[PDB]
């Protein structure tokens, strides 16, 4: 028993949402993700390449409107958000592939 | 632009499931029907009465009308 590594019970993913609303906060945060494959899967390599195409942004990127990331360009052109990031958080048996962004109340919709 | 200018809301959390993770018509017997009955019960004595009253008036008036069409034997009892 002492030298056997314990296998953890699997965690069920659920398409769903949780909305914590507080209009008194200056900017809104939104994260959206689908279930990932987990460390061992080779696809994680492709997923990361994918996230690279979309990439990330934040009002201090100098590239501004010329950034190669389409989403980044749009965010700039239309003042869509203060920032956004893609991620591919892995775990043993599962993971989270998604993106998170920070925007002003009135631009959440376009950004999303 | 009507979304984002509606109300000043604070401290409310809501949890929701995708439609594909749940059932469309859940707990028909434990929740649905009971409530249907509850809803029916709570309204029946507010709606029914005047409709029942209308019905009566209708029946009376319909019968009272046909009755006035029949002949009263008391108009021919001395027509020899």
Q: Which of A38, A76, A77 is nearest to A60 (CA)?
A: A76
The secondary element (H helix, E strand) that includes residue B14 is strand B10-17
- CATH class for the region spanning B1-80: mainly alpha
Q: Up-side HSE of residue B45: CA atoms within 13 Å toward CB?
A: 3
Nearest CA in chain A to B17: A16
Beta-carbon contacts of A99 under 8 Å, excluding residues fewer than 6 positions away, are A31, A32, A33, A54, A84, A85, A86, A87
Specify the pairing of strand A28-35 against strand B10-17.
Answer: unpaired
Name the experimental technique.
X-ray
Helix spans in chain B (H): 33-67
Beta-carbon contacts of B79 under 8 Å, excluding residues fewer than 6 positions away, are none
Task: Sketch the domain layout of chain B as residue ranges.
Answer: 1-80
Cβ-based contacts of B17 with chain A (< 8 Å)? 14-16
E strands of A24-105, at which residues? 28-35, 56-58, 83-90, 95-103
Report the alpha-carbon distance of residue B14 to residue B6 in Å, rounded.
18
The secondary element (H helix, E strand) that includes residue A16 is strand A16-22
Answer yes or no: do A16 and B16 touch at CB < 8 A: yes
CB-based contact (8 Å) between B6 and chain A? Answer: no
CB-based contact (8 Å) between B20 and chain A? Answer: yes
């Amino acid at each position: 028993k002492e030298d056997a590594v314990p296998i953890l019970p699997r965690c069920r993913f659920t398409g769903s949402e949780i909305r914590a609303r507080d209009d008194a906060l200056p900017v809104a945060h939104v994260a959206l993700a689908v279930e990932g494959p987990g460390w061992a899967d080779p696809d994680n390599v492709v997923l990361h390449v994918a996230n690279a195409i979309i990439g990330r942004y934040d009002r201090t990127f100098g590239g501004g409107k010329h950034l190669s990331s389409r989403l980044a360009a749009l965010a700039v052109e239309h003042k869509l958000c203060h920032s956004f990031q893609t991620f591919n958080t892995s775990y043993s048996d599962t993971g989270l592939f998604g993106f998170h962004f920070v925007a002003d109340p009135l631009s959440i919709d376009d950004m999303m | 632009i009507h979304f984002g200018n509606l109300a000043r809301v604070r401290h409310i959390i809501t949890y929701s499931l995708s439609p594909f993770e749940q059932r469309a018509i859940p707990n028909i017997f434990s929740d649905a029907l009971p409530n249907v009955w509850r809803r029916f019960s709570s309204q029946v004595f507010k709606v029914a009465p005047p409709f029942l009253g209308a019905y009566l008036l209708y029946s009376w008036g319909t019968q009272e009308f046909e009755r006035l069409k029949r002949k009263n034997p008391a108009d021919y009892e001395n027509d020899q």
